[PDB]
Amino acid sequence: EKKFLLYDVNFGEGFNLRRDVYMRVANTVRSLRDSGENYILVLPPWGRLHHWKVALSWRLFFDLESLNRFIPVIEFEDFLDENRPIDQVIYLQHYAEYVRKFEKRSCLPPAESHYKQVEEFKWKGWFYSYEDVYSRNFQCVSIQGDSGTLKDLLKHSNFSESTSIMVDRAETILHEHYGEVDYWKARRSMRYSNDLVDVADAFRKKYLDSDDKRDKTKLVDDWTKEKPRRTAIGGPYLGIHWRRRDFLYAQLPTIPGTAKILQDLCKKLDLQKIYLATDAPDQEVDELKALLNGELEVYRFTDTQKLNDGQIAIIDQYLCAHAAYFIGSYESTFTFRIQEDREIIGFPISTTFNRLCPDTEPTCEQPCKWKIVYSPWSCWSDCSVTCGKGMRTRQRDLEQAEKCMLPEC
Q: Which residue is nearest to ligand NAG (CB)?
A: 104
Binds ligand NAG (CB under 6 A): choice among 156, 218, 369, 403: 156
Q: In Å, how far are 292, 296, 311, 356, 381 from 363, measured between CA atoms?
A: 22, 25, 34, 10, 22
Told to check if 113 binds a copy of itself by CB under 8 A, we report yes
Each residue 231-270 as x (binds a copy of itself by CB under 8 A) or -, in order, gives --------------xxx-x---------------------
Q: Quote the least distance from Cβ 138 to a copy of itself, whole Å.
A: 11
Of 13, 171, 176, 331, which residue is the catalytic one? 13
Site size toward ligand NAG (CB under 6 A) is 5
Q: Cβ distance 76 to 127 under 8 Å?
A: no
Number of Cβ within a 10 Å radius of residue 52 = 5
Neighbours of 16 (CB within 10 A): 19
Structure-derived torsion over alpha carbons of residues 187, 189, 192, 197, reported in degrees to the nearest 10: 110
**Is 167 in a helix, a strand, or coil?**
strand
Taking CB within 5 to 8 Å according to partner kind, which of a copy of itself, ligand NAG, none is near residue 141?
A: ligand NAG
Q: What, of a copy of itself, ligand NAG, none, does residue 60 touch, CB below 5 to 8 Å by kind?
A: none
Length of the chain: 409
Q: Is 1 among the residues known to form the active site?
A: no
Cα–Cα separations (whole angstroms), residue 255 to 50, 188, 259, 284? 23, 34, 6, 7
Site for a copy of itself contains 309 (CB under 8 A): no
Q: Judge whether 16 is annotated as a binding position.
A: yes
Is position 289 an interface residue for a copy of itself (rule: CB under 8 A)?
A: no
Task: Give the Å distances, CA to CA, from 98 to 145, 322, 392.
Answer: 9, 38, 10
Which residue from 1, 81, 99, 120 is in contact with a copy of itself, where contact means CB under 8 A?
Answer: 120
As measured in angstroms, the least distance from the Cβ of 139 to ligand NAG is 6
* Residue 59 annotated as part of some ligand binding site: no
Q: Which residue precedes each gap in the chain (C to N above 2.5 Å)?
A: 53, 97, 249, 374, 396
**Which x/- pattern over 103-132 shows residues binding ligand NAG (rule: CB under 6 A)?**
xx----------------------------
**351 Cα distance to chain centroid:** 21
Tell me which amino acid residue 383 is. C
Q: Are 310 and 19 in contact (CB under 8 A)?
A: no
Look at strands 235-241 and 273-277 and give their pairing: parallel
Q: Closest distance between a copy of itself and the C-beta of residue 239, in Å?
A: 23
Contact 242, 292 (CB under 8 A): no
* Residue selected from 158, 224, 254, 360 as contacting ligand NAG according to rule CB under 6 A: 158
Which residues are catalytic, by number?
A: 13
Q: Which residues of the shown chain bind ligand NAG in the complex (CB under 6 A)?
A: 103-104, 141, 156, 158
Residues tagged in the binding site annotation for GDP-beta-L-fucose: 12-16, 241-243, 316, 333-334
Q: Which residues of the shown chain bind a copy of itself in the complex (CB under 8 A)?
A: 12, 50-53, 107-110, 112-120, 122, 124-126, 129-131, 245-247, 249, 279, 281-283, 387, 407-409
Residues tagged in the binding site annotation: 12-16, 241-243, 316, 333-334
